[PDB]
Design an enzyme around this catalytic site. Structure first.
Site, PDB file in Angstrom:
ATOM      1  N   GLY A  84      -9.038  -4.349   7.011  1.00 39.22           N
ATOM      2  CA  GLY A  84      -9.587  -3.401   6.069  1.00 39.22           C
ATOM      3  C   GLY A  84     -10.254  -2.207   6.706  1.00 39.22           C
ATOM      4  O   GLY A  84     -10.692  -1.306   5.983  1.00 39.22           O
TER       5      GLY A  84
ATOM      6  N   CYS B 108      -8.911  -0.005   8.764  1.00 43.11           N
ATOM      7  CA  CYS B 108      -8.046   1.134   9.014  1.00 43.11           C
ATOM      8  C   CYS B 108      -8.573   2.356   8.276  1.00 43.11           C
ATOM      9  O   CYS B 108      -9.098   2.261   7.162  1.00 43.11           O
ATOM     10  CB  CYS B 108      -6.622   0.811   8.582  1.00 43.11           C
TER      11      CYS B 108
ATOM     12  N   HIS C 102       0.333   4.472   7.171  1.00 44.30           N
ATOM     13  CA  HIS C 102       0.877   3.150   6.879  1.00 44.30           C
ATOM     14  C   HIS C 102       0.302   2.537   5.605  1.00 44.30           C
ATOM     15  O   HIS C 102       0.768   1.464   5.208  1.00 44.30           O
ATOM     16  CB  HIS C 102       0.713   2.191   8.078  1.00 44.30           C
TER      17      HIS C 102
END
Lengths: 300, 300
Positions: free
Chosen positions: A143, A145, A41
């Site tokens: 942040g 991820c 993503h």
């Protein structure tokens, strides 16, 4: 003596953590040999997330759309591919600090260490369990991820989780390192929510053995129950069924303490039916279920 | 979101950990530049521990009595000295992975990460608080002496603890890295025991703010108390006094949540006086006091 929620030493993983930017989105990637792994993503705009076709979105990208930073050195991306919900970014430099590693998928009930990272920089390390409903109760901010979960065995890092999203209850969902989600969650914007969860019975029993090993004995009794009759009480309290395999796995802890598993189950039955009456076990006023039998042996 | 007991990433410290053997005793040492730091009781026999004169025992040792192992490479000891309760072993090789570091002594109530080690090899990492009675509730087994506690700020490792002993209650005692014990404990065999402990009030308040930040609000009320009247209730329940400096330190968390500190104190008063009535806060059924205001800000 003593018993703590203990993570694996994180150094081997810190050396693999990089920063990945695509467009305006920045997150974390895992750099092993000449490949950086990150959540796919990263290629999405906030509007892509409503109904993305990642096949389309990735065709429209080029290698130069991905900026990879390993500390101060920039890593040149020379190829890219999608593997389920992770992106694989081929880079021109193999990571000189690549540890011996494996990609393993874990089972609900098993634990792992999470190295929370921001902008490719490690921030903290803590222990998590994969819940029966395939969420994890982590600590993650915007942040994070791409932060990964792992276990270490001897010298070999077994990566088992990479972080993708927070669900509405504040719990967390992600994939294994082959990009396959844990549980029925997707990397798109829906009303998806964690399903009902259960308590990991075999772990509660392991932790009761840890308490005995550490001198906490007040909950012990002389009674012993049968597996069947224990499981009737477990179901009532939203505990997972206990199997003979679970009894066998608890074997070493049973032998070290001299308390048979079904004897411990009678204690757990009583605790469930009466509570702790204002007492604590290993510093907790509730029954802890995020320590596996292995975690207890490793620390006791 | 989420809130976890989180340690600092341990890589920078793992690279400093070595094995130190003297006679038949093996434990851990900390290798910074050309010096290895370890507990001085490494030079003792079980009989020395009953009433040791470390000045005498160390005069009777030579450099070659100390065998230092950094992974597979042996480190040649070229000098030795005693600094309070730690030994400083000069070695012929500066540690090429020495981080920027400081030796800082911490205050009761402050937290730090512990890297538990055995035979110079890191085993796990967890967070600890210095208790008001100057013990720590760690997880340490035989062979863990010399494991260190630390915080990281930017790129700089602030070492604050090295482990020396377990007290009879299963809690742990050690020194700062200048070899000065935390609390009234000594590195000899006595009937020494932890003194009575208190709960770290400012930390409980910090953790209540963490809960609000994470959506746990059930314990809030519209009341507000005075500092004086709160402290009368704190004393009764074995809580440390709350000072105006503590109120000021909680300032940012108060502002982020819009709940004044003395408003939170009224909630804490109620929790102390009535219990939680079967509810939990951030996954705990008791009031947690091992998160500092800094720990909460850093994670929330």
């Amino acid at each position: 003596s003593g018993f703590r929620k203990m993570a694996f030493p994180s150094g081997k993983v810190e050396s693999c953590m990089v920063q990945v930017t695509c467009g305006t989105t920045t997150l974390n990637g895992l750099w092993l040999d000449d490949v950086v792994y990150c959540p796919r993503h990263v290629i999405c705009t906030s509007e892509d997330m409503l109904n993305p076709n990642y096949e389309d979105l990735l065709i429209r990208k080029s290698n130069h759309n991905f900026l990879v930073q390993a500390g101060n050195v920039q890593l040149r991306v020379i190829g890219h591919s999608m593997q389920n919900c992770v992106l694989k970014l081929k880079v021109d430099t193999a990571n000189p600090k690549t540890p011996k590693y494996k990609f393993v998928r874990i089972q609900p009930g098993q634990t792992f260490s999470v190295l929370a990272c921001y902008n490719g920089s490690p921030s903290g390390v803590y222990q998590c369990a994969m819940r029966p409903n395939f969420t994890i109760k982590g600590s993650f901010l915007n942040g994070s991820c791409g932060s990964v979960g792992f276990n270490i065995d001897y010298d070999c890092v077994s990566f088992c989780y990479m972080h993708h999203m927070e669900l509405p209850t504040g719990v967390h969902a992600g994939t294994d390192l082959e990009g396959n989600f844990y549980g029925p969650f997707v990397d798109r914007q829906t009303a998806q929510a964690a399903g009902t969860d259960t308590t990991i019975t075999v772990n509660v029993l392991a932790w009761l053995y840890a308490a005995v090993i550490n001198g906490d004995r007040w909950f012990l009794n002389r009674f012993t129950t049968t597996l069947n009759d224990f499981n009737l009480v477990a179901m009532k309290y939203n505990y997972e069924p206990l199997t003979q395999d679970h009894v066998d796995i608890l074997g070493p802890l049973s032998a070290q303490t001299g308390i048979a598993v079904l004897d411990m189950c009678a204690s757990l039955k009583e605790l469930l039916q009466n509570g702790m009456n204002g007492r604590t076990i290993l510093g907790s006023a509730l029954l802890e279920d995020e320590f596996t039998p292995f975690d207890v042996v490793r620390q006791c």
